[PDB]
Antibody, heavy 219, light 219 residues
Framework: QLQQSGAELVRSGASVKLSCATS????????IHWVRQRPEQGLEWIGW????????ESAPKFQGKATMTADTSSNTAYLQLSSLTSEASAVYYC??????????????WGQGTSVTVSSAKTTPPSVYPLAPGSAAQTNSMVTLGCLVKGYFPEPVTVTWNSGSLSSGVHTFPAVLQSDLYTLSSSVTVPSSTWPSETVTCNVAHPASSTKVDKKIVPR | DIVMSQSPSSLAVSVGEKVTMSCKSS????????????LSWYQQKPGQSPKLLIY???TRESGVPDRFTGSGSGTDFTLTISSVKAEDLAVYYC????????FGGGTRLEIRRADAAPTVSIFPPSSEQLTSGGASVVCFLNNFYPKDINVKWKIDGSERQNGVLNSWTDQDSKDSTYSMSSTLTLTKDEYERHNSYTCEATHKTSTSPIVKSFNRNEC
């Protein structure tokens, strides 16, 4: 299981340092590949690095614009992207591959790092509880929501009751309006569980170290 | 530089049916003094990192259902899924690793299921957001199929087609339905200026518009 660094907001023309680490094995027994995916776009290969000897290779597209290094001491792989442009805004993945071990190729992937290249500043979100209107209890099921408004950049994580409520949960993709993101999430539980029991939506915005817990209380 | 092209760009099939998607490269991926086809297939479920399914054109990765089969040689390749499961929903890509690495445009696999009417919920602005001068009205339209749906907002009878944010979730891995969020943002003043707010939806599942509304007056 690979661990990648957190979301990054970088200024146009600046550079970024991305990390990919693991403690479940020696990164020396693998080849490290970096891959990126732009919004509503496909996959794009960037290059590979052999931690074992420092050998590397980049796609023509990223020649002399993407340094790849490794620190086998802490079992970590790095990818440096220089002179970043708005086009480089995407989700970067690291992929550790190996076939010299068993009769099957070992393939591991990181969770991805969201890199946004922009002139805008990070903006924490406002979290608003969405309680049903007076008319929404004479039913059997009840729907509640949380509105995560005006943040930048992506992404945000939303959970309900710290993960104890997952079935019935819907988290909608963020929409960009006036250079700020807005996202909403809904959860549907039995009318017998709420308001009798407390429902809370938890929001985290990595880019701004923002943590919010908002309890949904009836109107 | 080798170019990869895939077809179809997307297709929908119901659970249990067989599916075949192809991949084409502008140059042969079969190494002469080796007899190996340098091609691979990856699967990427929504929100997740891609996963290796097949390499060497036909070698299945360990832990990959026998449902997936890779065939082809030279410039023509195919990925086949014997009996599609609702969990197979994702985007499939082929990658050549003959000369550098390049990914095809991918094939999006959707799941066809029985039609389902949406469960609609409308939410007045939060007392907290109003205390900040903002007023967002939200409407959720959950668990519906097909994806095609029409939503319109009405305020005191007058429709509003400006200042509305809509977002669709990816098809659900479990029930194969779609959900959508529609947010109407106004200023507190404009909000306090009217009484009736309506979220109206049209879906092929009904010959009548599903309507939900509330009057600011009530508590």
């Amino acid at each position: 299981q690979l661990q990648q660094s957190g979301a990054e907001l970088v200024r146009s023309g600046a550079s970024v340092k991305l990390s990919c680490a693991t403690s479940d094995f020696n990164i020396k027994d693998y080849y490290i590949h970096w891959v990126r995916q732009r919004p509503e776009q496909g996959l794009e290969w960037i290059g590979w690095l052999d931690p074992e000897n420092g050998d590397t290779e980049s796609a023509p597209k990223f020649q002399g614009k993407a340094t790849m290094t490794a620190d086998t001491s802490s079992n970590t792989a790095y990818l440096q992207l220089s002179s970043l442009t708005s086009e480089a805004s995407a989700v970067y993945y690291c992929n550790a591959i190996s076939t010299t071990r068993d009769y099957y190729a070992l393939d591991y992937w990181g969770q991805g790092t969201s890199v946004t290249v922009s002139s805008a500043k990070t903006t924490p979100p406002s979290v608003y509880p969405l309680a049903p209107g007076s008319a929404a209890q004479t039913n059997s099921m009840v729907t509640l929501g949380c509105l995560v408004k005006g943040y930048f950049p992506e992404p945000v994580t939303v959970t309900w009751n710290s993960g104890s409520l997952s079935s019935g949960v819907h988290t909608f993709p963020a929409v960009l309006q006036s250079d700020l993101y807005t996202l909403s999430s809904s959860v549907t539980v039995p009318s017998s569980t709420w308001p009798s029991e407390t429902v809370t939506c938890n929001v985290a915005h990595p880019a701004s170290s923002t943590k919010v817990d908002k309890k949904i209380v009836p109107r | 530089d080798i170019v990869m092209s895939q077809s179809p760009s997307s297709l929908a099939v119901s659970v249990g049916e067989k599916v075949t998607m192809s991949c084409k490269s502008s140059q042969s991926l079969l190494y002469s003094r080796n007899q190996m086809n340098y091609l691979s297939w990856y699967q990427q479920k929504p929100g997740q990192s891609p996963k290796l399914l097949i390499y060497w054109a036909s070698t299945r990765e360990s832990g990959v259902p026998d449902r997936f089969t890779g065939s082809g040689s030279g410039t023509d390749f195919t990925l086949t899924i014997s009996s599609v499961k609702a969990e197979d929903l994702a985007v499939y890509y082929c990658q050549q690793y003959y000369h550098y690495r390049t990914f095809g445009g991918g094939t999006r696999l959707e799941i066809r299921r029985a039609d389902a009417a949406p469960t609609v919920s409308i939410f007045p602005p939060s007392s907290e957001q109003l205390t900040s001068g903002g007023a967002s009205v939200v409407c959720f339209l959950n668990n519906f199929y097909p994806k095609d749906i029409n939503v319109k907002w009405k305020i005191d009878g007058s429709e509003r087609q400006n200042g509305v944010l809509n977002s669709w979730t990816d098809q659900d891995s479990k029930d194969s339905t779609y959900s959508m969020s529609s947010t109407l943002t106004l200023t507190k003043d404009e909000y306090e200026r009217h009484n009736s707010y309506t979220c109206e939806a049209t879906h092929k599942t009904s010959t009548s518009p599903i309507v939900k509304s509330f009057n600011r007056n009530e508590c």
